[PDB]
Every structure is written in structure tokens, then in C-alpha cells.
């Protein structure tokens, strides 16, 4: 039937919005990996088809059952994002604003792009001071506040400091609650998977910018990714100048 073109923000959870349509529009990267905003919308659905045909080019669309996914770019520009969204078949969709988080686009840029399409879009809904604390200060803060502290296991200087401060700790990937509460991860897992994990734990964090250095990101790229966190976080950067730069991004 003819589609009633619109962009409408709802305040309902995914399940509570399905009365409008069963169709979900997801965002993926060139490898078929789901954007953190899309990753929580595929519960109890086989998503083998997303990575099955990787690698993809921006604008590629993959579909199966109630799911539609489009490969979006990283702000290259708004033109590229518009062009990608135009490839989605016209229909009624529950979705999120495209290009958020690591992709670097703003909510205003996403609204502009969706309003140029002919689909009916139903948009699902959705801080602590920035500091320059050294590792010893961060560990002391995590210990007294019980905030979760993400730690990259490949950063040997950090692992050796934790082993020496918390004698007897058994460091392994995942949550380790010994002296302080840590989330140990490898750089061999994506920043997106890490953000999804921290969002699911739903704990307040004390953290360095995620992806910065460990995943080859610069501070601006890490700041963009950090927008995908749905938990409160005390972010600690390298120096007082990096505080201005980070809060500037």
C-alpha cells in the first residue's frame, strides 16, 4: 500500500512500537557489523545474513524477514549519508537516527537525510565531568566509587600497575571485580562490541576515551564513538589541554 512519508520520534521501547510496523531499519559497516544503536534491536532473530555477503560498499542494502540493513559512511559527508539512505526500499520502518556515534553525524544531519526519503520512519528514543587523571588516580577513584573501569589487556603498562596494586588479582578478559571493578577487553574486539557490552552492564564508568590508540582512533574519532555510550561516564584524557579539545569535540 502507498507509504505515508514521515519522520516521527516515539517514546516507546522497540516492543511497544511494533504496533506501528514489524519492519526494522538497521545500520551496518562495510563488514556487516551492526552499529551500536542497531545492535540491541535484533533479539531472537538470525542475523547471519548481515555478515554473510561482506565486504560491502556504502549504500548496499541487505534484507531478511522483518530486517533491512544499509551500509552507512563516516562523516564522509552529509551527501554520502543521504545517498546511502536513498537505497532503502520505501516502506514503514522502526529505526534510529542514521550516522550517530563513531560515524560522526549529528541528530540534525540525520533528520535532514531521513526527510529526503519517502519512507515512514518511527525513531526510537535516545553527563559526568571530563578530567585529566593519571592511572593511579583513576584506580583510586574506581575503588571508592565502585564505577566500572574498562582496561585494554594489550596495554601492558596498565596491566602491570593493576597486578602490583591488587596483589592476587587474576586478570582475564571480561568483568573482574577484585580491589576495583574492571572490564578487561582486547583491541581484537571492535569498539562497537565493547560499547554494546558496557551499555548492557548499565554501570557508571570511569574510562579513557574508548578506541583512542587501542583501535587506532585519534581523540576526535574516540569522542564521536563515545556518543554511543548510554551509561554515565567520568572520561579521563591525557592532559588539561586534551580536556578542552575533548569537551570541544
Curated annotation (Swiss-Prot):
Q: What is the effect of changing residue 17 to I?
A: In strain: Lambda/C.37
Q: Where in the cell is it found?
A: Host endoplasmic reticulum membrane
UniProt protein name: Papain-like protease nsp3
Q: Domain of life, per the record?
A: Viruses
Functionally, this protein is described as follows: Responsible for the cleavages located at the N-terminus of the replicase polyprotein. Participates together with nsp4 in the assembly of virally-induced cytoplasmic double-membrane vesicles necessary for viral replication. Antagonizes innate immune induction of type I interferon by blocking the phosphorylation, dimerization and subsequent nuclear translocation of host IRF3. Also prevents host NF-kappa-B signaling. In addition, PL-PRO possesses a deubiquitinating/deISGylating activity and processes both 'Lys-48'- and 'Lys-63'-linked polyubiquitin chains from cellular substrates.
The lineage is: Viruses, Riboviria, Orthornavirae, Pisuviricota, Pisoniviricetes
- Macro domain location is 2-126, 127-249
Q: How does it sit in the membrane?
A: Multi-pass membrane protein
Catalytic reaction(s) noted: Thiol-dependent hydrolysis of ester, thioester, amide, peptide and isopeptide bonds formed by the C-terminal Gly of ubiquitin (a 76-residue protein attached to proteins as an intracellular targeting signal)
Q: Span of the full-length protein shown?
A: 1231 to 1489 of 4405
How it assembles, according to the record, is:
May form homohexamers. Interacts with N protein.
Q: How is its activity regulated?
A: Inhibited in vitro by GRL-0617.
